[PDB]
Design an enzyme around this catalytic site. Structure first.
Site, mmCIF file in Angstrom:
data_model
loop_
_atom_site.group_PDB
_atom_site.id
_atom_site.type_symbol
_atom_site.label_atom_id
_atom_site.label_comp_id
_atom_site.label_asym_id
_atom_site.label_seq_id
_atom_site.Cartn_x
_atom_site.Cartn_y
_atom_site.Cartn_z
ATOM 1 N N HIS A 1 7.350 -36.123 -13.011
ATOM 2 C CA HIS A 1 6.668 -36.117 -14.304
ATOM 3 C C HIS A 1 7.170 -34.987 -15.197
ATOM 4 O O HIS A 1 6.785 -34.883 -16.359
ATOM 5 C CB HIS A 1 5.126 -36.070 -14.157
ATOM 6 N N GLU B 1 14.609 -15.492 -12.660
ATOM 7 C CA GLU B 1 13.640 -15.111 -13.686
ATOM 8 C C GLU B 1 12.382 -14.411 -13.179
ATOM 9 O O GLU B 1 11.934 -14.655 -12.057
ATOM 10 C CB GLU B 1 13.171 -16.367 -14.443
ATOM 11 N N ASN C 1 10.158 -12.217 -16.027
ATOM 12 C CA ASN C 1 9.528 -12.306 -17.343
ATOM 13 C C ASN C 1 10.376 -13.326 -18.093
ATOM 14 O O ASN C 1 11.497 -13.030 -18.467
ATOM 15 C CB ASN C 1 9.572 -10.965 -18.082
ATOM 16 N N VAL D 1 11.977 -12.079 -21.570
ATOM 17 C CA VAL D 1 12.827 -10.897 -21.679
ATOM 18 C C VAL D 1 14.000 -10.946 -20.716
ATOM 19 O O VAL D 1 13.796 -11.065 -19.517
ATOM 20 C CB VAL D 1 12.039 -9.611 -21.361
ATOM 21 N N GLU E 1 19.146 -12.965 -14.404
ATOM 22 C CA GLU E 1 19.072 -14.399 -14.680
ATOM 23 C C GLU E 1 20.400 -15.136 -14.703
ATOM 24 O O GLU E 1 21.456 -14.561 -14.951
ATOM 25 C CB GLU E 1 18.375 -14.670 -16.025
ATOM 26 N N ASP F 1 6.108 -38.362 -6.805
ATOM 27 C CA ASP F 1 6.359 -37.437 -7.909
ATOM 28 C C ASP F 1 7.377 -36.370 -7.518
ATOM 29 O O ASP F 1 7.029 -35.220 -7.230
ATOM 30 C CB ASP F 1 5.050 -36.772 -8.351
ATOM 31 N N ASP G 1 -6.107 -21.980 -8.186
ATOM 32 C CA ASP G 1 -5.454 -23.286 -8.272
ATOM 33 C C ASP G 1 -4.204 -23.175 -9.141
ATOM 34 O O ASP G 1 -3.964 -22.140 -9.768
ATOM 35 C CB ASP G 1 -6.441 -24.266 -8.917
ATOM 36 N N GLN H 1 -1.608 -26.171 -15.761
ATOM 37 C CA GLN H 1 -0.632 -26.656 -16.729
ATOM 38 C C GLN H 1 0.535 -25.666 -16.821
ATOM 39 O O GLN H 1 0.333 -24.483 -17.088
ATOM 40 C CB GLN H 1 -1.319 -26.807 -18.092
ATOM 41 N N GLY H 2 1.753 -26.149 -16.590
ATOM 42 C CA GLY H 2 2.916 -25.280 -16.659
ATOM 43 C C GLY H 2 3.482 -24.901 -15.303
ATOM 44 O O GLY H 2 4.593 -24.371 -15.213
ATOM 45 N N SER I 1 3.591 -27.239 -12.862
ATOM 46 C CA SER I 1 4.160 -28.492 -12.384
ATOM 47 C C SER I 1 5.620 -28.380 -11.977
ATOM 48 O O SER I 1 6.415 -27.727 -12.654
ATOM 49 C CB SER I 1 4.019 -29.572 -13.461
ATOM 50 N N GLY I 2 5.958 -29.034 -10.866
ATOM 51 C CA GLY I 2 7.322 -29.030 -10.367
ATOM 52 C C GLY I 2 7.646 -27.827 -9.509
ATOM 53 O O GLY I 2 8.690 -27.787 -8.857
HETATM 54 O O1 LIG Z 1 -6.763 -34.887 -15.111
HETATM 55 C C1 LIG Z 1 -5.575 -34.889 -15.508
HETATM 56 C C2 LIG Z 1 -4.760 -36.133 -15.114
HETATM 57 C C3 LIG Z 1 -4.095 -35.839 -13.713
HETATM 58 C C4 LIG Z 1 -3.231 -37.027 -13.216
HETATM 59 N N1 LIG Z 1 -3.978 -38.343 -13.283
HETATM 60 C C5 LIG Z 1 -3.967 -39.287 -12.178
HETATM 61 C C6 LIG Z 1 -4.492 -40.622 -12.347
HETATM 62 C C7 LIG Z 1 -4.462 -41.525 -11.246
HETATM 63 N N2 LIG Z 1 -3.937 -41.117 -10.039
HETATM 64 C C8 LIG Z 1 -3.431 -39.854 -9.847
HETATM 65 C C9 LIG Z 1 -3.431 -38.909 -10.904
HETATM 66 C C10 LIG Z 1 -4.725 -38.622 -14.566
HETATM 67 C C11 LIG Z 1 -5.637 -37.420 -14.960
HETATM 68 N N3 LIG Z 1 -5.077 -33.856 -16.221
HETATM 69 C C12 LIG Z 1 -5.951 -32.679 -16.546
HETATM 70 C C13 LIG Z 1 -5.283 -31.382 -15.985
HETATM 71 N N4 LIG Z 1 -3.947 -31.282 -16.658
HETATM 72 S S1 LIG Z 1 -3.189 -29.830 -16.412
HETATM 73 O O2 LIG Z 1 -4.109 -28.758 -16.744
HETATM 74 O O3 LIG Z 1 -2.000 -29.887 -17.224
HETATM 75 C C14 LIG Z 1 -2.647 -29.621 -14.716
HETATM 76 C C15 LIG Z 1 -1.305 -29.996 -14.365
HETATM 77 C C16 LIG Z 1 -0.839 -29.889 -13.032
HETATM 78 C C17 LIG Z 1 -1.709 -29.413 -12.016
HETATM 79 C C18 LIG Z 1 -1.250 -29.318 -10.707
HETATM 80 C C19 LIG Z 1 -2.099 -28.853 -9.677
HETATM 81 CL CL1 LIG Z 1 -1.457 -28.773 -8.088
HETATM 82 C C20 LIG Z 1 -3.451 -28.463 -9.956
HETATM 83 C C21 LIG Z 1 -3.942 -28.553 -11.290
HETATM 84 C C22 LIG Z 1 -3.082 -29.029 -12.333
HETATM 85 C C23 LIG Z 1 -3.542 -29.143 -13.686
HETATM 86 C C24 LIG Z 1 -3.046 -32.432 -16.314
HETATM 87 C C25 LIG Z 1 -3.662 -33.793 -16.744
HETATM 88 CA CA LIG Z 2 14.019 -13.032 -17.956
#
Ligand SMILES: O=C(C1CCN(c2ccncc2)CC1)N1CCN(S(=O)(=O)c2ccc3cc(Cl)ccc3c2)CC1
Ligand SMILES: [Ca+2]
Length: 223
Positions: free
Chosen positions: A40, A52, A54, A57, A62, A84, A171, A174-175, A177-178
């Site tokens: 994703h 990396e 910071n 900077v 790097e 994924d 936990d 956002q950011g 991921s991967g």
């Molecule tokens: O609830 C969601 C989506 C998450 C993915 N999703 C499905 C739907 C159906 N099956 C599986 C996943 C639909 C809802 N989001 C809210 C949280 N955001 S996030 O803050 O960007 C985020 C991204 C990646 C994360 C990874 C982890 Cl391991 C824990 C929290 C995370 C939180 C992503 C989208």
């Molecule tokens: Ca740097």
């Protein structure tokens, strides 16, 4: 990373940052020419940043290398998040050292209770918004499949596993991921998804890397 701590400059040598004019996802260096990340996180025009700390900077350790080829898992399903995982080949080999090193793939899956290290430059607040400039770290245990499936509102496939705390506060976010989930010196997971960040009863869901070792090996061998 919510509720984590400052890792310390280059203490996680395999952690990479994916850049497209700004940081948008994490990744892991698996060898001098390949990076593993989440499907994703796919995007065209990706530049991989190694060594990396910071991300705003230039600190001297790097290595900025453009992606020559990206390979999303053949069966990645963006609606269910199943499979994924993505592979990225670097235009040129990275120069390995004490601050830029690859992480080993696992030979066996990890069991529940195992303590792992999650890292990234993601949002650090469960409600507000606040992105760190330096790498954040978090120690977390792999949860049992039953509590994982029990806590998730969505379907958890055999290619996913939960890690974190049911009591909230710690936990990925956002950011992140991967990014890598390393246990016992082996890359066992990829930061994939979650229902919010650090919410009570809602752990992080990760891609189970031990189920893709064969695909990973064959792919890099033929590309
Ligand atoms: O609830 C969601 C989506 C998450 C993915 N999703 C499905 C739907 C159906 N099956 C599986 C996943 C639909 C809802 N989001 C809210 C949280 N955001 S996030 O803050 O960007 C985020 C991204 C990646 C994360 C990874 C982890 Cl391991 C824990 C929290 C995370 C939180 C992503 C989208
Ligand atoms: Ca740097």
């Amino acid at each position: 990373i919510v509720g984590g701590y400052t890792c310390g400059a280059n203490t996680v040598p395999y952690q990479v940052s994916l850049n497209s004019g700004y940081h948008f996802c994490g990744g892991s260096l698996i060898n001098s020419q390949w990076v593993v990340s989440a499907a994703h996180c796919y995007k065209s025009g990706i530049q991989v940043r190694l060594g990396e700390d910071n991300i705003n900077v230039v600190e001297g350790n790097e290595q900025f290398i453009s992606a020559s080829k990206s390979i999303v898992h053949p069966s990645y399903n963006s609606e269910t998040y199943n499979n994924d995982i993505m592979l990225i080949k670097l235009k040129s080999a990275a120069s390995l050292n004490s601050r830029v090193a690859s992480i080993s793939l696992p030979t066996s899956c990890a069991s529940a209770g195992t303590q792992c290290l999650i890292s990234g430059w993601g949002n650090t607040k469960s409600s507000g918004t606040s992105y760190p400039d330096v790498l954040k770290c978090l120690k977390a245990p792999i949860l049992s499949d039953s509590s994982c499936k029990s806590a998730s509102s969505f379907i958890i496939t055999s290619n996913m596993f939960c890690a974190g705390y049911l009591e909230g506060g710690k936990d990925a976010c956002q950011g992140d991921s991967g990014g890598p989930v390393v246990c016992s010196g082996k890359l066992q997971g990829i930061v994939s998804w979650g229902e919010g960040c650090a919410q009570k009863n809602k752990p992080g869901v990760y891609t189970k890397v031990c189920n893709y070792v064969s695909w990973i090996k064959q792919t890099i061998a033929s590309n």
